[PDB]
Amino acid sequence: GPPGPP
Amino acid sequence: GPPGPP
Amino acid sequence: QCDLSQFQTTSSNQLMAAIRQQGASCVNALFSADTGVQEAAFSSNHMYNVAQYTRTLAQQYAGGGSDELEALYLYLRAGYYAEFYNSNITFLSWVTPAVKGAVDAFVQNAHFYDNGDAHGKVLNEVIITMDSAGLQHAYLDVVTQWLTRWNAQYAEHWYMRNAVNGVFTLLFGGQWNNQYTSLIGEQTALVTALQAFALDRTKVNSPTEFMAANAARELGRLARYTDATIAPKVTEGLTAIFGQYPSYGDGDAIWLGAADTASYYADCSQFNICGFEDALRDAALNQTFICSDTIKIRSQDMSQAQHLAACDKMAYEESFFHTTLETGNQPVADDHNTQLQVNIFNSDTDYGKYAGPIFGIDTNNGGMYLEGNPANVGNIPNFIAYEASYANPDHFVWNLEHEYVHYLDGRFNMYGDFGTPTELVVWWSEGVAEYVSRVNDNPQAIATIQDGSTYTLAQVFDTTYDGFDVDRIYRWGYLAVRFMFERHPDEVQRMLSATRQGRWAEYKAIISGWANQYQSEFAQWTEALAKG
Ligand SMILES: [Ca+2]
Ligand SMILES: [Ca+2]
Ligand SMILES: [Ca+2]
Ligand SMILES: [Ca+2]
Ligand SMILES: [Zn+2]
């Protein structure tokens, strides 16, 4: 899945 | 195996 | 001051006004907002318009960072996150070529390879977007350039290390990218840049060692492409890494990074590191402390006082366990696990680096108990743990008492090896390890009642490890076990009579009867507990 928040 | 909580 | 209502709009121009006025900190809320916000904020039209505006603003970028561009690229990759995980959101086919245009403009800007923390903040979001948007095939040369240009002056800046480390996520994410995997086998310059980056000894013991370790790891992954034109360079680079660094010692994170991924696609004999795990276990767990003739410790770096406190607390837990579980000190049938080995690394980081190679375990957890086969004469079960500042004094071994109770439960309550039960026992195994070790000291267990989200006994009993719901497994497992010991200890022994004999269908019928008969009492009990 795509990267989450920083 | 059974894991311990983080 | 972050109002997410501004993003729930249908005009692209007000959206971007919200992005630029509220900033990256508020855009961050889009990852966890209700689908109403996300469907409004992340339409195909919004994403195309933001990408085209971002593209022109990025073309005008003149270095020194940009709060506006940081927020815009965050929004863009926030959109791909929501589209992946929200079934109500699906981007039309022209969205991604525009996002790629927005990324391309920052990449082609003369300031792309600038130094500095402010630039690193926007650069970070751009490099993450390359992965979020599935564009890994389009920026392979960016990976090579950053690896070739990196130096000590870039390394001064926390936000530059963080941003550029994202090029390794790009290589990792490209695995699921068909364009990437058709291209990667030709990227000889990238392979050369990767090995040079990781073989740089000035990175060892520095704040960039983790990037050199990620470089080695991504290079090990390219061992997959056994017939590709990069394969001789990949092999040569891995061989150089394995020869320059130790498997235990300064720079071993780079050695172990490469070994981890390369061992997945290449035989150990390809790099003449066959059997390295034996020497590593002896280097990493170099201490020996004998608690008794039934417990021995191998550890990385504990003091004598810690060793003594661990042995003493385990002797204490043993006694409390047998009394509380009313074992008569009689193990279950077919169980020869009289002796136990305890393995304790110096930190969670150490556990993460060394335990996988040594014990073959997943390390995304707080420790592990490996019962092996109790029916084999000579079997020695192991538990594996790490020291933590937040662990219990005086040993400061995280989950020491928890894993030890797993051993006791496994020998005195649960017939067979770990995979033996044909009904779910997760709630019991984890709940009794928590209850025996914590007894009534479990603030988090009280808190998960007070927050209003609860579980029935039937739900607790049907808990699995799937998704590792720590709240359900450990807190609610603890609550049900504590409840049964306090209110129905005769039923507990009746259940244990079934589990000790491996009578799993009978065990399940017993506890399903509890889930019907005792649910109201359990509900009142948790309520009283949450009150005081
Ligand atoms: Ca979707
Ligand atoms: Ca230590
Ligand atoms: Ca057992
Ligand atoms: Ca709760
Ligand atoms: Zn456990």
| CATH code for position C514 | 1.10.390.20
Pair (C297, C367) in one structural domain = yes
Give the alpha-carbon dihedral of C449, C451, C455, C457, to 10 degrees.
Answer: 10
The answer to whether residue C181 is domain-embedded is: no
d(CA C284, CA C28): 41
Other CB atoms within 10 Å distance of the CB of residue C467? 8
d(CA C271, CA C213): 18
CB contact under 8 A, C369 and B2: yes
Domain of C112 in residue numbering reads as 1-133
- Whether C149 is covered by a domain: the verdict is no
Q: Do chains B and C touch (3 or more CB pairs under 8 A)?
A: yes
The reply to whether C236 falls in a domain is no
- Identify whether C117 is part of a domain: yes
C350 and C425 both lie in a single domain: no
To the question of whether residue C448 is assigned a binding role by annotation, the answer is yes
Last residue of a domain, one of C351, C368, C400: C400
Determination technique used? X-ray
Decide: helix, strand or coil at residue C12: helix
Among chain A residues, CA nearest to C85: A1
**Is residue C352 assigned to a domain?**
yes
**Selection from C410, C432, C431 nearest residue C420 by Cα:** C410
Task: State whether C449 and C353 are in the same domain.
Answer: no
* Domain total of chain C: 3
Same domain flag for C366 and C485 = no
Paired tokens of C411: 């020998």
Closest CA to C492 of C436, C419, C428, C442: C428
Do C484 and C396 reside in the same domain of the chain? no
Q: How many CB atoms lie within 10 A of CB C528?
A: 10
> Is residue C525, in this structure, part of any structural domain at all?
yes
| CB within 8 Å: C74 and A2 | no
Query: Is the same domain home to C369 and C438?
Result: no
Give the DSSP letter string of C433-469.
Answer: HHHHHHTT--HHHHHHHHTS----HHHHHT--STT--
Interface touch C365/B1, C-beta < 8 Å = no
C360 and C300 in a single domain? The answer is: yes
Between the alpha carbon of residue C274 and those of residues C213, C269, C360, C387, C412, the distances in Å are 21, 6, 15, 29, 38
> Is C198 a member of any domain?
no
Contacts of B1 in chain C (CB under 8 A): 361, 368-371, 406, 418
In a domain, C519, yes or no: yes
Q: Are B2 and C383 in contact (CB under 8 A)?
A: no
Asked whether residue C380 falls in the same domain as residue C469, the answer is: no
The CA distance from C407 to C497, in Å, is: 18
Length of chain C as a residue count: 532
Q: Name chain A contacts of C42, Cβ cutoff 8 Å.
A: none
Q: How many CB pairs under 8 A join A and C?
A: 25
* Contacts of residue C91, Cβ cutoff 8 Å, sequence gap at least 6: C44, C47, C79, C80, C83
Of the residues C403, C423, C491, C506, only one is catalytic, namely C403
Q: How many CB atoms lie within 10 A of CB C149?
A: 12
C416 is in an annotated binding site: yes
CATH code: domain of residue C304? 3.40.30.160
Report the chain A residue with the minimal C-alpha distance to residue C125.
A6
Tokens for C169? Answer: 């996520």
Which residues 6+ apart lie within 8 Å of C363 measured at CB? C351, C352, C355, C356
Residues C474 and C527 reside in one and the same domain: yes
Among C133, C151, C170, the domain boundary falls at C133
Q: Could you tell me if C389 and C475 lie in one domain?
A: no
Question: What separation in Å is there between the alpha carbon of C383 and the centre of ligand 4?
Answer: 30
b (16+ CB within 10 A) / e for C354-391: bbbbbbebebebbbbbbbbebeeeebebbbbbbbeeeb
Instruction: Check whether C249 is labelled as a binding-site residue.
Output: no
CB contact (8 A) between residue B4 and residue C366: yes
- The residue to which tokens 């792309």 are assigned: C112
Cβ-in-10-Å burial (0-12, 13-18, 19+) of C308 comes to: middle
Q: Could you say which ligand is closest to the alpha carbon of residue C388?
A: 2
Looking at the structure, tell me whether residues C396 and C474 fall in a common domain: no
- Does B4 sit within 8 Å of C385, measured CB to CB? yes
In the block, tokens 């090995």 appear at C195
C521 has catalytic annotation: no
Question: By the 8 A CB rule, do C367 and C386 touch?
Answer: yes
Distance of CA C406 to the CA centre of its chain: 22
Q: Within 13 Å, how many C-alpha atoms sit on residue C414's CB side? A: 25
C524 and C450 both lie in a single domain: yes
* C67/C365 Cα distance (integer angstroms): 37
State which of C133, C150, C171 marks the end of a domain: C133
Report the candidate in C250, C286, C280 with the shortest Cα–Cα distance to residue C263.
C280
Residue C479 CB partners (closer than 8 Å, separation 6+): C431, C445, C449, C460, C526, C529
Cβ proximity of C475 and C449 under 8 Å: no
Q: Is C301 annotated as a binding residue?
A: yes
Long-range interactions of C90-93: CB distance < 8 A, separation 24+: C91/C44, C91/C47, C92/C44
